[PDB]
Protein backbone atom coordinates (compact mmCIF):
# COMPACT_ATOMS: atom_id res chain seq x y z
CA UNK A 1 0.00 0.00 0.00
CA UNK A 2 2.36 2.52 0.90
CA UNK A 3 5.96 2.14 0.92
CA UNK A 4 8.09 3.75 3.28
CA UNK A 5 5.21 4.57 5.37
CA UNK A 6 6.11 2.87 8.51
CA UNK A 7 8.75 0.22 8.36
CA UNK A 8 11.75 0.11 6.22
CA UNK A 9 11.27 1.38 2.87
CA UNK A 10 11.58 -1.51 0.47
CA UNK A 11 14.48 -0.99 -2.02
CA UNK A 12 14.68 -3.53 -4.90
CA UNK A 13 16.76 -3.79 -8.11
CA UNK A 14 15.61 -0.15 -8.66
CA UNK A 15 18.43 0.54 -6.12
CA UNK A 16 15.97 3.00 -4.48
CA UNK A 17 12.62 3.06 -2.57
CA UNK A 18 10.01 1.24 -4.66
CA UNK A 19 6.81 2.89 -5.67
CA UNK A 20 3.89 1.81 -3.64
CA UNK A 21 0.31 1.90 -4.69
CA UNK A 22 0.03 5.23 -2.83
CA UNK A 23 2.52 7.82 -4.30
CA UNK A 24 1.76 6.83 -7.94
CA UNK A 25 -1.50 8.80 -7.37
CA UNK A 26 -0.13 11.32 -4.90
CA UNK A 27 2.26 13.92 -5.18
CA UNK A 28 3.42 16.42 -7.58
CA UNK A 29 3.27 13.46 -9.81
CA UNK A 30 0.55 11.57 -8.40
CA UNK A 31 -1.75 10.57 -11.04
CA UNK A 32 -3.84 13.40 -10.01
CA UNK A 33 -1.72 16.14 -10.39
CA UNK A 34 0.00 15.44 -13.40
CA UNK A 35 -1.75 13.12 -15.61
CA UNK A 36 -4.78 14.24 -14.62
CA UNK A 37 -5.01 17.78 -14.42
CA UNK A 38 -2.24 18.22 -16.80
CA UNK A 39 -2.16 15.86 -19.58
CA UNK A 40 0.11 16.05 -22.47
CA UNK A 41 -1.82 16.47 -25.72
CA UNK A 42 -0.79 16.29 -29.41
CA UNK A 43 -1.89 18.54 -32.33
CA UNK A 44 0.81 20.87 -30.94
CA UNK A 45 4.17 22.42 -31.92
CA UNK A 46 6.82 24.43 -30.16
CA UNK A 47 9.51 26.61 -31.20
CA UNK A 48 11.64 29.43 -30.72
CA UNK A 49 10.11 32.63 -31.20
CA UNK A 50 10.93 35.75 -33.07
CA UNK A 51 9.53 39.17 -33.76
CA UNK A 52 7.25 38.86 -36.82
CA UNK A 53 7.33 42.39 -38.36
CA UNK A 54 5.49 42.74 -41.73
CA UNK A 55 3.07 40.14 -40.23
CA UNK A 56 0.46 42.20 -38.30
CA UNK A 57 -1.05 41.28 -34.88
CA UNK A 58 -3.79 38.60 -34.59
CA UNK A 59 -1.54 36.69 -36.93
CA UNK A 60 1.31 34.46 -36.39
CA UNK A 61 4.09 33.15 -38.25
CA UNK A 62 4.18 29.72 -38.74
CA UNK B 1 -17.12 44.72 -41.86
CA UNK B 2 -17.08 41.08 -40.58
CA UNK B 3 -14.57 42.24 -37.90
CA UNK B 4 -16.82 45.13 -36.72
CA UNK B 5 -19.80 42.75 -37.23
CA UNK B 6 -18.10 40.10 -35.03
CA UNK B 7 -17.71 43.00 -32.55
CA UNK B 8 -21.28 44.41 -32.96
CA UNK B 9 -22.44 40.83 -32.79
CA UNK B 10 -21.44 40.46 -29.32
CA UNK B 11 -21.39 44.11 -28.44
CA UNK B 12 -25.23 43.97 -28.24
CA UNK B 13 -26.41 40.37 -27.60
CA UNK B 14 -26.83 37.72 -24.83
CA UNK B 15 -23.97 36.23 -22.73
CA UNK B 16 -20.90 36.32 -24.86
CA UNK B 17 -21.05 32.68 -24.27
CA UNK B 18 -24.60 32.40 -24.99
CA UNK B 19 -23.91 33.80 -28.22
CA UNK B 20 -21.16 31.88 -29.28
CA UNK B 21 -22.70 28.71 -28.81
CA UNK B 22 -25.41 29.62 -30.76
CA UNK B 23 -23.24 30.85 -33.34
CA UNK B 24 -21.73 27.67 -33.15
CA UNK B 25 -24.28 25.14 -33.51
CA UNK B 26 -25.54 27.28 -36.14
CA UNK B 27 -22.65 26.90 -38.26
CA UNK B 28 -22.71 23.40 -37.31
CA UNK B 29 -25.94 23.27 -39.17
CA UNK B 30 -24.50 25.71 -41.79
CA UNK B 31 -21.94 22.88 -42.30
CA UNK B 32 -24.23 19.84 -41.76
CA UNK B 33 -26.98 21.52 -43.85
CA UNK B 34 -25.60 22.81 -47.21
CA UNK B 35 -22.92 20.14 -46.54
CA UNK B 36 -20.02 21.19 -48.81
CA UNK B 37 -22.49 23.23 -50.94
CA UNK B 38 -20.48 26.25 -52.13
CA UNK B 39 -16.91 24.92 -51.45
CA UNK B 40 -16.87 27.32 -48.43
CA UNK B 41 -13.09 26.60 -48.15
CA UNK B 42 -12.75 30.41 -47.75
CA UNK B 43 -16.02 31.47 -46.03
CA UNK B 44 -15.83 28.74 -43.32
CA UNK B 45 -19.38 27.70 -42.24
CA UNK B 46 -18.41 29.42 -38.94
CA UNK B 47 -17.64 32.58 -40.82
CA UNK B 48 -20.76 32.30 -42.60
CA UNK B 49 -22.49 31.67 -39.54
CA UNK B 50 -21.09 34.79 -37.99
CA UNK B 51 -21.85 37.23 -40.87
CA UNK B 52 -25.36 35.77 -41.42
CA UNK B 53 -25.75 36.24 -37.61
CA UNK B 54 -23.80 39.54 -37.24
CA UNK B 55 -25.33 41.29 -40.31
CA UNK B 56 -27.99 39.10 -42.01
CA UNK B 57 -29.57 38.22 -38.62
CA UNK B 58 -28.94 41.86 -37.53
Amino acid sequence: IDNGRRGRTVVGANNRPLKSLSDIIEGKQGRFRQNLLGKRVDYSGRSVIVVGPKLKIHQCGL
Amino acid sequence: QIMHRAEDLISAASNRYRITVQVANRAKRRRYEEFESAEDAMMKPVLRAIIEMSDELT
Binding site: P53, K56, I57, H58 | M3, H4, A6, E7, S11
Partner: protein, 59 residues
Protein backbone atom coordinates in the same frame (compact mmCIF):
# COMPACT_ATOMS: atom_id res chain seq x y z
CA UNK C 1 -11.07 64.26 -33.53
CA UNK C 2 -9.11 65.84 -30.99
CA UNK C 3 -5.94 66.93 -32.20
CA UNK C 4 -3.37 66.59 -29.49
CA UNK C 5 -0.01 68.43 -29.44
CA UNK C 6 2.05 66.41 -26.89
CA UNK C 7 5.25 64.29 -26.70
CA UNK C 8 3.76 60.77 -26.96
CA UNK C 9 5.75 57.63 -25.98
CA UNK C 10 4.95 55.83 -22.69
CA UNK C 11 1.56 56.48 -21.00
CA UNK C 12 0.52 59.06 -23.63
CA UNK C 13 -0.32 56.02 -25.83
CA UNK C 14 -1.41 53.99 -22.75
CA UNK C 15 -4.38 56.12 -21.86
CA UNK C 16 -4.82 57.03 -25.29
CA UNK C 17 -5.64 53.66 -26.07
CA UNK C 18 -8.15 53.20 -23.51
CA UNK C 19 -9.71 56.26 -24.67
CA UNK C 20 -10.08 54.82 -27.91
CA UNK C 21 -11.42 51.86 -26.49
CA UNK C 22 -14.33 53.21 -24.79
CA UNK C 23 -15.07 55.24 -27.54
CA UNK C 24 -14.76 52.82 -30.18
CA UNK C 25 -14.67 49.31 -30.66
CA UNK C 26 -11.99 47.21 -29.85
CA UNK C 27 -11.52 46.20 -33.29
CA UNK C 28 -10.76 49.53 -34.22
CA UNK C 29 -8.46 50.25 -31.53
CA UNK C 30 -6.46 47.33 -32.39
CA UNK C 31 -6.10 48.30 -35.73
CA UNK C 32 -5.13 51.55 -34.53
CA UNK C 33 -2.68 50.30 -32.17
CA UNK C 34 -1.13 48.77 -34.88
CA UNK C 35 -0.87 51.47 -37.29
CA UNK C 36 0.78 53.34 -34.93
CA UNK C 37 3.29 51.02 -33.63
CA UNK C 38 4.13 51.03 -37.04
CA UNK C 39 4.98 54.55 -36.84
CA UNK C 40 6.84 54.00 -33.89
CA UNK C 41 9.20 51.90 -35.56
CA UNK C 42 9.77 53.55 -38.60
CA UNK C 43 10.51 56.76 -37.12
CA UNK C 44 12.59 55.39 -34.49
CA UNK C 45 14.71 54.07 -37.11
CA UNK C 46 14.74 57.14 -38.93
CA UNK C 47 15.94 58.86 -36.19
CA UNK C 48 18.70 56.67 -35.84
CA UNK C 49 19.54 56.50 -32.31
CA UNK C 50 22.62 55.06 -30.65
CA UNK C 51 24.22 55.06 -27.14
CA UNK C 52 27.81 54.63 -25.82
CA UNK C 53 30.13 55.01 -22.76
CA UNK C 54 30.51 58.63 -23.99
CA UNK C 55 26.69 58.94 -24.35
CA UNK C 56 26.89 58.07 -20.67
CA UNK C 57 27.46 61.56 -19.70
CA UNK C 58 28.77 62.29 -16.34
CA UNK C 59 27.21 64.79 -14.15
Amino acid sequence: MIFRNRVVDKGQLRNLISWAFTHYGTARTAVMADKLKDLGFRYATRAGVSISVDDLMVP
